[PDB]
Design a protein around this nucleic acid. Sequence first.
DNA 1: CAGTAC
DNA 2: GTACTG
Length: 246
Amino acid sequence: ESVPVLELFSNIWGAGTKTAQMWYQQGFRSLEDIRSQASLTTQQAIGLKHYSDFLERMPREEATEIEQTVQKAAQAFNSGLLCVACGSYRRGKATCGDVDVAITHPDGRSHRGIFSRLLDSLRQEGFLTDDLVSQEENGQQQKYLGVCRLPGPGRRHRRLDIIVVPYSEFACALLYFTGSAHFNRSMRALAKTKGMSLSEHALSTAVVRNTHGCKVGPGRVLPTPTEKDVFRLLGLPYREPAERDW
DNA sequence: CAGTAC
DNA sequence: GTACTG
């Protein structure tokens, strides 16, 4: 009966195995026990009150409405901005556990300062209901993880991820956000073999390494306007997102 | 460390 | 395999 309890606790957002185990040793057995007695982070507190909803996958159609809600608000600030949903949605599978949204501008200048008031604009609609994390200091990009909910009767809370990237990095950002995770690992794993490096920011060549293969060199960054450029520079056949669902 | 994003 | 903040 311990294993199921570790399952129950691990399905709380923000809680993993180490926390589930600690909660078990404290004698906690139910979600009610956790809510009333355990020390929760604001994250864990939010994931616990949205436990059922976060546990339910969403239809592709509803993920569209979520992206468009983001898209419309973002563009109101600017016509130029691109709001492309990634992750499970872009890979084209029928259900989504979350909605990943990448945002950029063709020029590479107009994207700055939007992130802060885009989030503010969404909160006024009543769209955003909770915030999980913010990474304002992330290179030239910002990432937000929060909880939204579409207008209307009988609607569930959903996990929402927003990142804002420069057009110089829009390629590797999409390559990261669409995934999948296993797919991203394998591709970056191949980069180490070829003496390169792949991040959500850029693909880099001439990357130095030591005897034990630990990285000591930043390498030089190769310009990649789109997803096909990085695929080509890696000596690999391009694959569509649907083909990326590993 | 632990948990998370893909 | 990278890369964040908690």
